[PDB]
Structures are given as structure tokens and as C-alpha cells.
């Protein structure tokens, strides 16, 4: 599943609901700490609509437990990310992913 650990608290009241657009900044890493993706490097926030499955299951379930303004570390198992096949060339098979995610606002 996905484990959510707080890095900096959000408002503790406003939680994402299915259908809303989450605007986040994130950095993805492999178990070892190797960065594979980061909206922060592109200095452009990433947006996705909750419930539309346009992101991995771990994001759908983990970001829904975060509140606006919160920054958390999500540790995601293979079955909630890219599974056995992974994404050859970027993500290994059966990879446990770690994401540093900050929820900036909801639209």
C-alpha cells in the first residue's frame, strides 16, 4: 500500500475529494534515493484530477489523506505503482517508490 509521513503540516482541514484537481510539486525516488522525476526541476507544478486514475494508485490514495499546504513523504509498494513490469529504462520491475509531495492548492 502507501505509507504517508508528514514533513510539514498543511491546514489539517481541507482534504482532496474525488473530482477535484490537485496541484502538487513532487520528487520521485527509487528505494536507494536515486531521483527519477521531479516537477521541481522543471519549476512547474503538476496537476491531476483525483479519481480519474491519471496517476498511480498510491497517489490516488495517499494524496487524499493530505491537506492543503501539507508536504509529505509517500512510500509506495510496486502493486500501487508500476508493478512487476515497471517501466523499462526508467522504473525497475517490482520497485518500491518514494515521493516527496507538497499539495499547493485544489481546483
The single residue of 11, 41, 46, 82 carrying the catalytic annotation is 82
Query: After which residues does the chain become discontinuous at a C–N distance over 2.5 Å?
Result: none
Which grid coordinates are listed for 90? Answer: 526508467
Strand locations in 9-87, DSSP E? Answer: 21-30, 35-38, 46-49, 71-76
Binds ligand NH4 (CB under 6 A): choice among 87, 90, 96, 105: 87
The single residue of 32, 46, 48, 56 carrying the catalytic annotation is 56
Q: Decide if 82 is catalytic.
A: yes
Which grid coordinates are listed for 33? Answer: 534515493
Q: Decide if 37 is catalytic.
A: yes
Task: Compare residues 69 and 86 and give the one whose CB is closer to ligand NH4.
Answer: 86
What's the closest the beta carbon of residue 93 comes to ligand NH4, in angstroms?
9
Amino acid at each position: 500500500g502507501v505509507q504517508v509521513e508528514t514533513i510539514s503540516p498543511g491546514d489539517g482541514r481541507t482534504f482532496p475529494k474525488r473530482g477535484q484537481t490537485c496541484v502538487v510539486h513532487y520528487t520521485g525516488m527509487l528505494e536507494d534515493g536515486k531521483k527519477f522525476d521531479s516537477s521541481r526541476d522543471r519549476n512547474k507544478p503538476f496537476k491531476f484530477m483525483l479519481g480519474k486514475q491519471e496517476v498511480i494508485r498510491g497517489w490516488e490514495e495517499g494524496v487524499a489523506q493530505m491537506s492543503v499546504g501539507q508536504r509529505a513523504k509517500l512510500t509506495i509498494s510496486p502493486d500501487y505503482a508500476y508493478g512487476a513490469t515497471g517501466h523499462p529504462g526508467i522504473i525497475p520491475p517490482h520497485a518500491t517508490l518514494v515521493f516527496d509531495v507538497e499539495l499547493l492548492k485544489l481546483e
